[PDB]
Amino acid sequence: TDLKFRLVRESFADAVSWVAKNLPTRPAVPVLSGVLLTGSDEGLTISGFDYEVSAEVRVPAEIASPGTVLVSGRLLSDITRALPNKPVDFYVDGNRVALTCGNARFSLPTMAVEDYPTLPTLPEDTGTLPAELFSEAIGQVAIAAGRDDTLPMLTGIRVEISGEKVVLAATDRFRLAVRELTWNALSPDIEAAVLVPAKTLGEAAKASEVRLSLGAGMGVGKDGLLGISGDGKRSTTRLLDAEFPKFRQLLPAEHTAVASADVAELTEAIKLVALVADRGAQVRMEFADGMLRLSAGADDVGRAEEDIAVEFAGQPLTIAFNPTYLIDGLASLHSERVSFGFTTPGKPALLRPADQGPFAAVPTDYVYLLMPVRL
Amino acid sequence: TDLKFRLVRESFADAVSWVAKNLPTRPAVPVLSGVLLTGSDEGLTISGFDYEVSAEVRVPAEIASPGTVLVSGRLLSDITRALPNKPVDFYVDGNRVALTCGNARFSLPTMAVEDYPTLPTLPEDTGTLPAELFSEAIGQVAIAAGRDDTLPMLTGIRVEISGEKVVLAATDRFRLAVRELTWNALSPDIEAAVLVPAKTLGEAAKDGSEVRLSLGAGMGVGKDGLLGISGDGKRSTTRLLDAEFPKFRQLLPAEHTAVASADVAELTEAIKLVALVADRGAQVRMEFADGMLRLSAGADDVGRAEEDIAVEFAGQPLTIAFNPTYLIDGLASLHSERVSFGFTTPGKPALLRPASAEDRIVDQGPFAAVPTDYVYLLMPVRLP
Amino acid sequence: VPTLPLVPXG
Amino acid sequence: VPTLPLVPXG
């Protein structure tokens, strides 16, 4: 039987474009540029899959005749975004799709559905959490992941689950981001840790309640997949089999100095002084006497300094950073102020949202640990 | 004397950034990355040289000590745009500049003022017109200029002046854009034509009162090899192109076998839609007849597309094909709600001209060309 | 892809 | 540009 359906343009366009956004820019084989449309009494399903990430959305539609068809995905996305804002009729007549909408008509070739991989089945549901928290937490941690697929152990977000408590962690060897949260667990005996490709997870986050599917009980992570579901949408990503670094060793228990600053004021000041930094390599932070002297540059191109008021206590120090990595950490706090914990100018700096020492580390739900650069 | 001044940040930043926009991003020698700052008699002049465009701006300033200095323009532009909103103090101490603003302090190296090339003198004033009109007219024709230095005769905008009448024209051999306007000439006997590099003049068309163009006076218009542009305490010179503009006036058709009009937004949206299946975005096909336009594209291998829109149409029906990018460029340059098409055959240029929604099309032809201040003449492509 | 009938030029 | 004292890792 040949698929024939009708549905509202905007509904059609939103569903196709969400599936098509994930399609490979460099398709390993041509058939992976397609999206699959499947019509049943249970509605219209639009899906895509490239052997690593799958995406699937069900939308209400008037199905005049059930069936399945594969067509060029980004082409279908661009068409549905540009059609007149009228109901869209879509009829497959064998090897050819007739698409009509208002005063417009398209005739599109079909692709070889028999060659398209089958979408993986989701593991059992593991837990749920609000979309807002999912998006915030992943955004805070993904910023620290490695971006080099030749070092897969760094390209993941580690996800540790213990009952109702989740810990997310990512590192690229220069910063480490760790976020703790509470979620709604759906299974009891969950004591597991998986590693999820960060880019994929980050994109799933930037798109109502979210359900994570990794399996149940002792089976969590055993199927090598994470399913993410919500709002008639459902995606899967293959887990990484790489081993995550021992990040808890890095978290300092005590600080020789602690400081707090206004996040926006500090961010703007780093952007200003780094204008004279060679290749934006480093900005220097001189802490003492309730004052932060932020500086950069050299005599060849120019020197800059801005002094901003801070709370400071402990051993004064000058410590230098990659200004992009520092802005990245500040932007991830989502708080008005930042609290710093330091040991020495050669050792990691702890950033978290906000007599003379040493200062015990303060419990928090988010840390961004940033290695300095050498002066 | 060492230059020392203070002024408000926004004024400094706008002035410096306006001069620095024309500096090379990869200057051959450091002096070419510089802008010259000269302070005297309650004013600060900021000057920038480049081999094609030079520019100069004067803004008020509290001058504590007069002088001149040369510093990196792009860097200074970036700094002043990001400084706190406090008065900016600037003093030269030997071979270094100390720039202080609120809680921020910069120390910049200077360069040898005597090594900065001399900015060209503006030619005698030629005429004036509103800044808005000038930027719009340039923007309209600049889209049609070639962008290939190996065909330099295509990379300009032609400026014809005949008394109060100015004509701007550009072509890349596939479209020709011609815009006529009136201005206020400042001397009699101006009858001349020059060629200005399009990329320059086009980008420069982006607010003011009246713009003054300086290409000389009377019979001397064009002799200095420069186009001066002035207004709002800013002056610039642009070096003219030595190439020769093609003989475009014989392209303009006096009579059409068919005329049509369409809504510009509807037609633009329809072209973008059907062109989605056009191979290399190479062509869309327009079949005109019976108050309808059938717009189509594509082929069996990738998909076919059609959209039919209402048009006003008279004369001999025809099917004619265009590069959809060039077609949209022309529609976007009309700056009107509707477009009027003039056709002869599917293989000869199509004339596009602005039409208002209060215009309307009629007999069955033939149709004399309608006088218009703007024309975009587009060569069709061959039908498959 | 013909050019405008510019003489010379095409 | 030293790395975090990750062992192994650096």
PDB file of N, CA, C and O in Angstrom, chain A residues 75 78-80 82-84 96 101 103-109 265 268 271-273 275-276 298-309, chain B residues 72 75 78-79 82-84 96 103-109 266 269 272-274 276-277 299-310:
ATOM      1  N   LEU A  75      16.106  18.258   1.711  1.00  0.00           N
ATOM      2  CA  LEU A  75      15.238  18.785   0.663  1.00  0.00           C
ATOM      3  C   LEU A  75      13.789  18.856   1.152  1.00  0.00           C
ATOM      4  O   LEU A  75      13.138  19.900   1.045  1.00  0.00           O
ATOM      5  N   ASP A  78      13.498  21.737   3.677  1.00  0.00           N
ATOM      6  CA  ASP A  78      13.482  23.069   3.073  1.00  0.00           C
ATOM      7  C   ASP A  78      12.177  23.331   2.340  1.00  0.00           C
ATOM      8  O   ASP A  78      11.634  24.437   2.408  1.00  0.00           O
ATOM      9  N   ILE A  79      11.659  22.334   1.628  1.00  0.00           N
ATOM     10  CA  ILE A  79      10.377  22.513   0.951  1.00  0.00           C
ATOM     11  C   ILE A  79       9.277  22.817   1.966  1.00  0.00           C
ATOM     12  O   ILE A  79       8.533  23.793   1.826  1.00  0.00           O
ATOM     13  N   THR A  80       9.128  21.967   2.984  1.00  0.00           N
ATOM     14  CA  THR A  80       8.017  22.174   3.908  1.00  0.00           C
ATOM     15  C   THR A  80       8.148  23.501   4.638  1.00  0.00           C
ATOM     16  O   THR A  80       7.137  24.105   5.004  1.00  0.00           O
ATOM     17  N   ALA A  82       9.156  26.202   3.197  1.00  0.00           N
ATOM     18  CA  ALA A  82       8.891  27.260   2.235  1.00  0.00           C
ATOM     19  C   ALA A  82       7.523  27.163   1.570  1.00  0.00           C
ATOM     20  O   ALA A  82       7.201  28.014   0.741  1.00  0.00           O
ATOM     21  N   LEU A  83       6.720  26.152   1.887  1.00  0.00           N
ATOM     22  CA  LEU A  83       5.445  25.981   1.207  1.00  0.00           C
ATOM     23  C   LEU A  83       4.476  27.088   1.611  1.00  0.00           C
ATOM     24  O   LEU A  83       4.676  27.761   2.624  1.00  0.00           O
ATOM     25  N   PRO A  84       3.418  27.305   0.824  1.00  0.00           N
ATOM     26  CA  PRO A  84       2.337  28.182   1.296  1.00  0.00           C
ATOM     27  C   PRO A  84       1.778  27.622   2.592  1.00  0.00           C
ATOM     28  O   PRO A  84       1.826  26.417   2.840  1.00  0.00           O
ATOM     29  N   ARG A  96       7.373   7.618  -6.921  1.00  0.00           N
ATOM     30  CA  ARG A  96       7.266   9.067  -6.999  1.00  0.00           C
ATOM     31  C   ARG A  96       6.327   9.609  -5.931  1.00  0.00           C
ATOM     32  O   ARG A  96       5.247   9.057  -5.713  1.00  0.00           O
ATOM     33  N   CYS A 101       0.187  21.684  -2.067  1.00  0.00           N
ATOM     34  CA  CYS A 101      -0.109  22.600  -0.968  1.00  0.00           C
ATOM     35  C   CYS A 101      -0.445  23.952  -1.581  1.00  0.00           C
ATOM     36  O   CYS A 101       0.434  24.584  -2.176  1.00  0.00           O
ATOM     37  N   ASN A 103      -1.260  26.688  -4.093  1.00  0.00           N
ATOM     38  CA  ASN A 103      -0.964  26.788  -5.521  1.00  0.00           C
ATOM     39  C   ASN A 103       0.375  26.143  -5.899  1.00  0.00           C
ATOM     40  O   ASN A 103       0.881  26.397  -7.001  1.00  0.00           O
ATOM     41  N   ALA A 104       0.961  25.326  -5.019  1.00  0.00           N
ATOM     42  CA  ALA A 104       2.259  24.707  -5.259  1.00  0.00           C
ATOM     43  C   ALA A 104       2.152  23.193  -5.404  1.00  0.00           C
ATOM     44  O   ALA A 104       1.312  22.539  -4.777  1.00  0.00           O
ATOM     45  N   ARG A 105       3.036  22.633  -6.224  1.00  0.00           N
ATOM     46  CA  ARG A 105       3.044  21.190  -6.416  1.00  0.00           C
ATOM     47  C   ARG A 105       4.476  20.731  -6.645  1.00  0.00           C
ATOM     48  O   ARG A 105       5.241  21.377  -7.378  1.00  0.00           O
ATOM     49  N   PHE A 106       4.839  19.632  -5.989  1.00  0.00           N
ATOM     50  CA  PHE A 106       6.159  19.038  -6.124  1.00  0.00           C
ATOM     51  C   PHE A 106       6.004  17.576  -6.501  1.00  0.00           C
ATOM     52  O   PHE A 106       5.072  16.900  -6.055  1.00  0.00           O
ATOM     53  N   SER A 107       6.946  17.096  -7.309  1.00  0.00           N
ATOM     54  CA  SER A 107       7.071  15.688  -7.662  1.00  0.00           C
ATOM     55  C   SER A 107       8.489  15.260  -7.305  1.00  0.00           C
ATOM     56  O   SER A 107       9.451  15.713  -7.932  1.00  0.00           O
ATOM     57  N   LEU A 108       8.623  14.406  -6.289  1.00  0.00           N
ATOM     58  CA  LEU A 108       9.915  14.053  -5.708  1.00  0.00           C
ATOM     59  C   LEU A 108      10.223  12.580  -5.924  1.00  0.00           C
ATOM     60  O   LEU A 108       9.330  11.740  -5.760  1.00  0.00           O
ATOM     61  N   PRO A 109      11.469  12.224  -6.239  1.00  0.00           N
ATOM     62  CA  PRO A 109      11.815  10.803  -6.319  1.00  0.00           C
ATOM     63  C   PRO A 109      11.894  10.209  -4.921  1.00  0.00           C
ATOM     64  O   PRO A 109      12.226  10.894  -3.953  1.00  0.00           O
ATOM     65  N   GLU A 265      30.463  41.771  35.151  1.00  0.00           N
ATOM     66  CA  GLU A 265      31.562  42.728  35.181  1.00  0.00           C
ATOM     67  C   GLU A 265      32.900  42.061  34.860  1.00  0.00           C
ATOM     68  O   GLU A 265      33.727  42.624  34.134  1.00  0.00           O
ATOM     69  N   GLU A 268      33.005  41.059  30.940  1.00  0.00           N
ATOM     70  CA  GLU A 268      33.263  42.219  30.106  1.00  0.00           C
ATOM     71  C   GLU A 268      34.712  42.674  30.238  1.00  0.00           C
ATOM     72  O   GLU A 268      35.347  43.047  29.241  1.00  0.00           O
ATOM     73  N   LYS A 271      37.079  40.403  28.265  1.00  0.00           N
ATOM     74  CA  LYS A 271      36.976  40.672  26.834  1.00  0.00           C
ATOM     75  C   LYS A 271      37.703  41.959  26.471  1.00  0.00           C
ATOM     76  O   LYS A 271      38.305  42.057  25.396  1.00  0.00           O
ATOM     77  N   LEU A 272      37.675  42.951  27.362  1.00  0.00           N
ATOM     78  CA  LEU A 272      38.334  44.220  27.063  1.00  0.00           C
ATOM     79  C   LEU A 272      39.851  44.070  27.087  1.00  0.00           C
ATOM     80  O   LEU A 272      40.534  44.416  26.119  1.00  0.00           O
ATOM     81  N   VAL A 273      40.409  43.542  28.182  1.00  0.00           N
ATOM     82  CA  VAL A 273      41.869  43.498  28.282  1.00  0.00           C
ATOM     83  C   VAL A 273      42.469  42.494  27.299  1.00  0.00           C
ATOM     84  O   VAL A 273      43.587  42.694  26.807  1.00  0.00           O
ATOM     85  N   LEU A 275      41.948  42.144  24.339  1.00  0.00           N
ATOM     86  CA  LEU A 275      42.136  42.701  23.010  1.00  0.00           C
ATOM     87  C   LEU A 275      43.616  42.860  22.659  1.00  0.00           C
ATOM     88  O   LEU A 275      43.969  42.851  21.475  1.00  0.00           O
ATOM     89  N   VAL A 276      44.496  42.993  23.658  1.00  0.00           N
ATOM     90  CA  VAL A 276      45.935  43.088  23.402  1.00  0.00           C
ATOM     91  C   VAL A 276      46.673  41.780  23.695  1.00  0.00           C
ATOM     92  O   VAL A 276      47.912  41.747  23.618  1.00  0.00           O
ATOM     93  N   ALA A 298      51.683  42.838  25.912  1.00  0.00           N
ATOM     94  CA  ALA A 298      53.128  43.018  26.013  1.00  0.00           C
ATOM     95  C   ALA A 298      53.506  44.293  25.263  1.00  0.00           C
ATOM     96  O   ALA A 298      52.694  44.874  24.538  1.00  0.00           O
ATOM     97  N   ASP A 299      54.761  44.718  25.434  1.00  0.00           N
ATOM     98  CA  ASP A 299      55.207  45.997  24.878  1.00  0.00           C
ATOM     99  C   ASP A 299      55.141  46.048  23.354  1.00  0.00           C
ATOM    100  O   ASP A 299      55.087  47.146  22.785  1.00  0.00           O
ATOM    101  N   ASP A 300      55.145  44.896  22.681  1.00  0.00           N
ATOM    102  CA  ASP A 300      55.183  44.897  21.220  1.00  0.00           C
ATOM    103  C   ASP A 300      53.853  45.340  20.616  1.00  0.00           C
ATOM    104  O   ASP A 300      53.833  46.077  19.623  1.00  0.00           O
ATOM    105  N   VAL A 301      52.735  44.895  21.187  1.00  0.00           N
ATOM    106  CA  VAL A 301      51.424  45.191  20.636  1.00  0.00           C
ATOM    107  C   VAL A 301      50.614  46.134  21.521  1.00  0.00           C
ATOM    108  O   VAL A 301      49.785  46.891  21.000  1.00  0.00           O
ATOM    109  N   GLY A 302      50.825  46.118  22.826  1.00  0.00           N
ATOM    110  CA  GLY A 302      50.080  46.959  23.743  1.00  0.00           C
ATOM    111  C   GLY A 302      49.817  46.237  25.050  1.00  0.00           C
ATOM    112  O   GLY A 302      49.773  45.009  25.122  1.00  0.00           O
ATOM    113  N   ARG A 303      49.636  47.010  26.111  1.00  0.00           N
ATOM    114  CA  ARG A 303      49.341  46.452  27.420  1.00  0.00           C
ATOM    115  C   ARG A 303      48.031  47.024  27.933  1.00  0.00           C
ATOM    116  O   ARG A 303      47.675  48.170  27.631  1.00  0.00           O
ATOM    117  N   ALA A 304      47.315  46.221  28.713  1.00  0.00           N
ATOM    118  CA  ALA A 304      46.013  46.627  29.218  1.00  0.00           C
ATOM    119  C   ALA A 304      45.833  46.139  30.642  1.00  0.00           C
ATOM    120  O   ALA A 304      46.326  45.078  31.027  1.00  0.00           O
ATOM    121  N   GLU A 305      45.092  46.918  31.414  1.00  0.00           N
ATOM    122  CA  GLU A 305      44.749  46.514  32.761  1.00  0.00           C
ATOM    123  C   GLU A 305      43.403  47.126  33.101  1.00  0.00           C
ATOM    124  O   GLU A 305      43.131  48.280  32.753  1.00  0.00           O
ATOM    125  N   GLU A 306      42.572  46.355  33.789  1.00  0.00           N
ATOM    126  CA  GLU A 306      41.368  46.883  34.402  1.00  0.00           C
ATOM    127  C   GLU A 306      41.277  46.361  35.828  1.00  0.00           C
ATOM    128  O   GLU A 306      41.494  45.165  36.076  1.00  0.00           O
ATOM    129  N   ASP A 307      40.964  47.249  36.765  1.00  0.00           N
ATOM    130  CA  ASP A 307      40.860  46.890  38.179  1.00  0.00           C
ATOM    131  C   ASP A 307      39.392  46.847  38.589  1.00  0.00           C
ATOM    132  O   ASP A 307      38.663  47.832  38.413  1.00  0.00           O
ATOM    133  N   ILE A 308      38.944  45.703  39.092  1.00  0.00           N
ATOM    134  CA  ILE A 308      37.564  45.584  39.536  1.00  0.00           C
ATOM    135  C   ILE A 308      37.550  45.137  40.991  1.00  0.00           C
ATOM    136  O   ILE A 308      38.465  44.460  41.476  1.00  0.00           O
ATOM    137  N   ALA A 309      36.506  45.541  41.698  1.00  0.00           N
ATOM    138  CA  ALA A 309      36.417  45.219  43.109  1.00  0.00           C
ATOM    139  C   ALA A 309      35.966  43.777  43.276  1.00  0.00           C
ATOM    140  O   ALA A 309      35.090  43.294  42.556  1.00  0.00           O
TER     141      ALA A 309
ATOM    142  N   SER B  72      47.761  51.859  15.916  1.00  0.00           N
ATOM    143  CA  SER B  72      47.017  50.823  15.200  1.00  0.00           C
ATOM    144  C   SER B  72      45.519  51.110  15.221  1.00  0.00           C
ATOM    145  O   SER B  72      44.901  51.163  16.296  1.00  0.00           O
ATOM    146  N   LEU B  75      42.941  47.935  16.253  1.00  0.00           N
ATOM    147  CA  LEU B  75      43.065  47.725  17.688  1.00  0.00           C
ATOM    148  C   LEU B  75      42.432  48.874  18.465  1.00  0.00           C
ATOM    149  O   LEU B  75      41.654  48.653  19.401  1.00  0.00           O
ATOM    150  N   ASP B  78      38.677  48.500  18.245  1.00  0.00           N
ATOM    151  CA  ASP B  78      38.196  47.458  19.156  1.00  0.00           C
ATOM    152  C   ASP B  78      38.219  47.918  20.615  1.00  0.00           C
ATOM    153  O   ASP B  78      37.279  47.649  21.361  1.00  0.00           O
ATOM    154  N   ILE B  79      39.288  48.598  21.045  1.00  0.00           N
ATOM    155  CA  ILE B  79      39.387  49.030  22.442  1.00  0.00           C
ATOM    156  C   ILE B  79      38.304  50.049  22.769  1.00  0.00           C
ATOM    157  O   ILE B  79      37.558  49.895  23.746  1.00  0.00           O
ATOM    158  N   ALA B  82      34.817  48.974  23.403  1.00  0.00           N
ATOM    159  CA  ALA B  82      34.592  48.141  24.580  1.00  0.00           C
ATOM    160  C   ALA B  82      34.950  48.824  25.899  1.00  0.00           C
ATOM    161  O   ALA B  82      34.792  48.209  26.958  1.00  0.00           O
ATOM    162  N   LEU B  83      35.420  50.069  25.869  1.00  0.00           N
ATOM    163  CA  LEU B  83      35.786  50.769  27.095  1.00  0.00           C
ATOM    164  C   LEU B  83      34.536  51.077  27.922  1.00  0.00           C
ATOM    165  O   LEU B  83      33.423  51.097  27.394  1.00  0.00           O
ATOM    166  N   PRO B  84      34.699  51.334  29.222  1.00  0.00           N
ATOM    167  CA  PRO B  84      33.560  51.798  30.031  1.00  0.00           C
ATOM    168  C   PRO B  84      32.982  53.091  29.478  1.00  0.00           C
ATOM    169  O   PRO B  84      33.630  53.824  28.731  1.00  0.00           O
ATOM    170  N   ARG B  96      54.872  56.142  23.318  1.00  0.00           N
ATOM    171  CA  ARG B  96      53.764  55.320  23.761  1.00  0.00           C
ATOM    172  C   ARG B  96      52.580  56.205  24.094  1.00  0.00           C
ATOM    173  O   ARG B  96      52.731  57.354  24.523  1.00  0.00           O
ATOM    174  N   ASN B 103      37.947  52.539  35.098  1.00  0.00           N
ATOM    175  CA  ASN B 103      38.897  51.681  35.800  1.00  0.00           C
ATOM    176  C   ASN B 103      39.846  50.942  34.847  1.00  0.00           C
ATOM    177  O   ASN B 103      40.556  50.028  35.278  1.00  0.00           O
ATOM    178  N   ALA B 104      39.884  51.330  33.576  1.00  0.00           N
ATOM    179  CA  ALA B 104      40.680  50.657  32.561  1.00  0.00           C
ATOM    180  C   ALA B 104      41.866  51.517  32.149  1.00  0.00           C
ATOM    181  O   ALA B 104      41.767  52.754  32.099  1.00  0.00           O
ATOM    182  N   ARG B 105      42.993  50.861  31.860  1.00  0.00           N
ATOM    183  CA  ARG B 105      44.174  51.569  31.369  1.00  0.00           C
ATOM    184  C   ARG B 105      44.832  50.751  30.265  1.00  0.00           C
ATOM    185  O   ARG B 105      45.050  49.546  30.427  1.00  0.00           O
ATOM    186  N   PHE B 106      45.109  51.396  29.133  1.00  0.00           N
ATOM    187  CA  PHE B 106      45.842  50.787  28.033  1.00  0.00           C
ATOM    188  C   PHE B 106      47.109  51.590  27.782  1.00  0.00           C
ATOM    189  O   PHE B 106      47.119  52.811  27.936  1.00  0.00           O
ATOM    190  N   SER B 107      48.169  50.890  27.395  1.00  0.00           N
ATOM    191  CA  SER B 107      49.431  51.488  26.967  1.00  0.00           C
ATOM    192  C   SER B 107      49.722  50.974  25.560  1.00  0.00           C
ATOM    193  O   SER B 107      49.965  49.779  25.381  1.00  0.00           O
ATOM    194  N   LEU B 108      49.667  51.865  24.546  1.00  0.00           N
ATOM    195  CA  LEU B 108      49.826  51.409  23.167  1.00  0.00           C
ATOM    196  C   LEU B 108      51.112  51.940  22.554  1.00  0.00           C
ATOM    197  O   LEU B 108      51.464  53.104  22.777  1.00  0.00           O
ATOM    198  N   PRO B 109      51.811  51.133  21.753  1.00  0.00           N
ATOM    199  CA  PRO B 109      52.963  51.655  21.012  1.00  0.00           C
ATOM    200  C   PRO B 109      52.499  52.571  19.887  1.00  0.00           C
ATOM    201  O   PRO B 109      51.368  52.483  19.411  1.00  0.00           O
ATOM    202  N   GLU B 266       5.430  38.020  -3.198  1.00  0.00           N
ATOM    203  CA  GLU B 266       4.895  36.728  -3.621  1.00  0.00           C
ATOM    204  C   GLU B 266       5.809  36.054  -4.636  1.00  0.00           C
ATOM    205  O   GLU B 266       6.052  34.842  -4.560  1.00  0.00           O
ATOM    206  N   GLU B 269       9.085  34.811  -2.945  1.00  0.00           N
ATOM    207  CA  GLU B 269       8.850  33.610  -2.153  1.00  0.00           C
ATOM    208  C   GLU B 269       8.656  32.393  -3.047  1.00  0.00           C
ATOM    209  O   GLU B 269       9.163  31.303  -2.746  1.00  0.00           O
ATOM    210  N   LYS B 272      12.082  31.233  -4.505  1.00  0.00           N
ATOM    211  CA  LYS B 272      12.858  30.531  -3.489  1.00  0.00           C
ATOM    212  C   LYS B 272      12.325  29.126  -3.279  1.00  0.00           C
ATOM    213  O   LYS B 272      13.092  28.193  -3.036  1.00  0.00           O
ATOM    214  N   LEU B 273      11.010  28.962  -3.349  1.00  0.00           N
ATOM    215  CA  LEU B 273      10.433  27.647  -3.139  1.00  0.00           C
ATOM    216  C   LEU B 273      10.771  26.714  -4.296  1.00  0.00           C
ATOM    217  O   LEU B 273      11.282  25.610  -4.081  1.00  0.00           O
ATOM    218  N   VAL B 274      10.502  27.135  -5.533  1.00  0.00           N
ATOM    219  CA  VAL B 274      10.700  26.199  -6.645  1.00  0.00           C
ATOM    220  C   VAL B 274      12.178  25.991  -6.913  1.00  0.00           C
ATOM    221  O   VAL B 274      12.586  24.906  -7.342  1.00  0.00           O
ATOM    222  N   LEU B 276      14.357  25.308  -4.968  1.00  0.00           N
ATOM    223  CA  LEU B 276      14.925  24.281  -4.095  1.00  0.00           C
ATOM    224  C   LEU B 276      15.310  23.022  -4.868  1.00  0.00           C
ATOM    225  O   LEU B 276      16.204  22.286  -4.445  1.00  0.00           O
ATOM    226  N   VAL B 277      14.652  22.740  -5.994  1.00  0.00           N
ATOM    227  CA  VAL B 277      15.004  21.560  -6.781  1.00  0.00           C
ATOM    228  C   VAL B 277      15.825  21.908  -8.020  1.00  0.00           C
ATOM    229  O   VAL B 277      16.104  21.019  -8.831  1.00  0.00           O
ATOM    230  N   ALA B 299      13.997  18.653 -12.286  1.00  0.00           N
ATOM    231  CA  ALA B 299      14.150  17.602 -13.279  1.00  0.00           C
ATOM    232  C   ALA B 299      13.813  16.276 -12.605  1.00  0.00           C
ATOM    233  O   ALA B 299      13.667  16.202 -11.382  1.00  0.00           O
ATOM    234  N   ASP B 300      13.714  15.220 -13.423  1.00  0.00           N
ATOM    235  CA  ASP B 300      13.243  13.928 -12.927  1.00  0.00           C
ATOM    236  C   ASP B 300      14.130  13.371 -11.820  1.00  0.00           C
ATOM    237  O   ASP B 300      13.631  12.710 -10.904  1.00  0.00           O
ATOM    238  N   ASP B 301      15.439  13.618 -11.883  1.00  0.00           N
ATOM    239  CA  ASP B 301      16.353  12.920 -10.985  1.00  0.00           C
ATOM    240  C   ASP B 301      16.247  13.438  -9.555  1.00  0.00           C
ATOM    241  O   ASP B 301      16.328  12.658  -8.600  1.00  0.00           O
ATOM    242  N   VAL B 302      16.084  14.745  -9.385  1.00  0.00           N
ATOM    243  CA  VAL B 302      16.089  15.345  -8.060  1.00  0.00           C
ATOM    244  C   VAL B 302      14.704  15.783  -7.606  1.00  0.00           C
ATOM    245  O   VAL B 302      14.495  15.951  -6.394  1.00  0.00           O
ATOM    246  N   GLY B 303      13.761  15.976  -8.524  1.00  0.00           N
ATOM    247  CA  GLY B 303      12.435  16.470  -8.195  1.00  0.00           C
ATOM    248  C   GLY B 303      12.021  17.631  -9.084  1.00  0.00           C
ATOM    249  O   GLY B 303      12.851  18.391  -9.586  1.00  0.00           O
ATOM    250  N   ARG B 304      10.715  17.755  -9.301  1.00  0.00           N
ATOM    251  CA  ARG B 304      10.147  18.870 -10.044  1.00  0.00           C
ATOM    252  C   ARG B 304       9.247  19.682  -9.133  1.00  0.00           C
ATOM    253  O   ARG B 304       8.641  19.145  -8.200  1.00  0.00           O
ATOM    254  N   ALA B 305       9.174  20.981  -9.418  1.00  0.00           N
ATOM    255  CA  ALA B 305       8.412  21.920  -8.611  1.00  0.00           C
ATOM    256  C   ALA B 305       7.696  22.896  -9.516  1.00  0.00           C
ATOM    257  O   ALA B 305       8.238  23.317 -10.543  1.00  0.00           O
ATOM    258  N   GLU B 306       6.500  23.286  -9.093  1.00  0.00           N
ATOM    259  CA  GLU B 306       5.742  24.318  -9.775  1.00  0.00           C
ATOM    260  C   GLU B 306       4.936  25.088  -8.740  1.00  0.00           C
ATOM    261  O   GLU B 306       4.462  24.514  -7.756  1.00  0.00           O
ATOM    262  N   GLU B 307       4.800  26.394  -8.961  1.00  0.00           N
ATOM    263  CA  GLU B 307       3.865  27.211  -8.202  1.00  0.00           C
ATOM    264  C   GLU B 307       3.269  28.221  -9.170  1.00  0.00           C
ATOM    265  O   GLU B 307       3.991  28.802  -9.990  1.00  0.00           O
ATOM    266  N   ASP B 308       1.957  28.392  -9.113  1.00  0.00           N
ATOM    267  CA  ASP B 308       1.252  29.304 -10.005  1.00  0.00           C
ATOM    268  C   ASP B 308       0.787  30.508  -9.206  1.00  0.00           C
ATOM    269  O   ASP B 308       0.136  30.350  -8.172  1.00  0.00           O
ATOM    270  N   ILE B 309       1.138  31.710  -9.661  1.00  0.00           N
ATOM    271  CA  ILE B 309       0.672  32.898  -8.968  1.00  0.00           C
ATOM    272  C   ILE B 309      -0.051  33.810  -9.951  1.00  0.00           C
ATOM    273  O   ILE B 309       0.167  33.758 -11.164  1.00  0.00           O
ATOM    274  N   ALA B 310      -0.940  34.636  -9.411  1.00  0.00           N
ATOM    275  CA  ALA B 310      -1.653  35.596 -10.240  1.00  0.00           C
ATOM    276  C   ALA B 310      -0.712  36.716 -10.653  1.00  0.00           C
ATOM    277  O   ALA B 310       0.098  37.199  -9.854  1.00  0.00           O
TER     278      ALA B 310
END
